[PDB]
């Protein structure tokens, strides 16, 4: 989005404050069995959260183990938990519309991936209607 106009310095301050409130509140739900008993027993905790300037999505970053199989198990349950976390945070009176929560591993995009090509061809249809 953001296809026209531009936000003020106070809009960036509002985004940063609201993202900080989402960070504490999401981390508090990871710290309770009220979202999931399994998620609470796995003892997962966030490192940070990032909110889009469009208000379109909330990327939540979680701390990982040495085991990739245990990481995939934690990631699957934490992504399953996200819709219920959104509903639990929707009890706040001031935040009219809680953004969709999406879970992310703590490692950043430090290199551009092995992305595939894209190609297309038009249909050789008849001239007649």
Q: Up-side HSE of residue 44: CA atoms within 13 Å toward CB?
A: 33
Q: Does residue 119 form part of some domain?
A: no
* Assigned domain for 3 exists: no
CB atoms within 10 A of CB 34: 13
At 9 the three-state DSSP class reads: helix
Q: Is residue 67 part of a domain?
A: yes
Q: Which domain holds residue 59?
A: 9-105
Measured distance CA(102)–CA(86) in Å, rounded: 10
Beta-strand ranges (E) seen in the chain are 46-51, 58-62, 101-105
Encode 75-110: b = buried (16+ Cβ within 10 Å), e = exposed: bebbeebbeebeebbeeeeeeeebbebebbeeeeee
Instruction: Give ∠ CA 94-100-101 in degrees, rounded to 5.
Output: 105
CATH code where residue 62 lies: 3.30.300.20
The set of residues, in sequence order, having a beta carbon less than 8 Å from that of 71 and lying 6+ positions away, is 64, 65, 105
Q: Token pair 């940070």 is at which residue? A: 48
- Are the C-beta atoms of 78 and 59 separated by less than 8 Å? no
């Amino acid at each position: 989005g953001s296809s026209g106009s531009s936000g003020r310095k106070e809009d960036h301050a509002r985004l940063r404050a609201l993202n900080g409130l989402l960070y504490k509140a999401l981390t508090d739900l990871l710290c309770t069995p009220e979202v999931s008993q399994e998620l609470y027993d796995l003892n997962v905790e966030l490192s940070k959260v990032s909110l889009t300037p469009d208000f379109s999505a909330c990327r939540a970053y979680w701390k990982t183990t040495l085991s990739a199989e245990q990481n995939a198990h934690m990631e699957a349950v934490l992504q399953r938990s996200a819709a219920h976390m959104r509903h639990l945070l929707m009890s706040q009176q001031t935040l009219r519309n809680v953004p969709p929560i999406v879970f992310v591993q703590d490692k950043g995009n430090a290199a551009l991936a092995e992305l595939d090509q894209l190609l297309a061809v038009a249909d050789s249809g008849p001239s007649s209607g």
